[PDB]
């Protein structure tokens, strides 16, 4: 796990509308294990489902994504989970919507 990464700069403000942790994958419509992109805030399924967030990474280059299952943040380039106070707000907003 990383306490910081050089890609945290890419994290954009949480949408004013907030987050929807039950939002379907934008490609396959599944609800199983979705992630939200911390740059564009599109929602796509994890790599153990249909890999649409991975596809999104491939298309966009956006580095950091947040899990709607356990609120872990993954950096595709660092290939690691990253935890940092820069992510405090987004994780809280997700948590509040979830519970």
């Amino acid at each position: 796990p990383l306490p910081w990464c050089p890609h945290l700069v890419a994290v954009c403000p949480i949408p004013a509308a907030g987050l929807d942790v039950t939002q379907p994958c934008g490609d396959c419509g599944t609800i199983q294990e979705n992630w939200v992109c911390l740059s564009c805030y599109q929602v796509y399924c994890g790599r153990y489902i249909n890999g649409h967030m991975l596809q999104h990474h491939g298309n966009s280059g956006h580095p950091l994504v947040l899990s709607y299952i356990d609120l872990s943040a993954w950096c595709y380039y660092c290939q690691a989970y990253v935890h940092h106070q820069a992510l405090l707000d987004v994780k809280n907003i997700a948590h509040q919507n979830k519970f």
Partner: peptide
């Protein structure tokens, strides 16, 4: 347990 790989993310993303």
């Amino acid at each position: 347990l790989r993310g993303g």
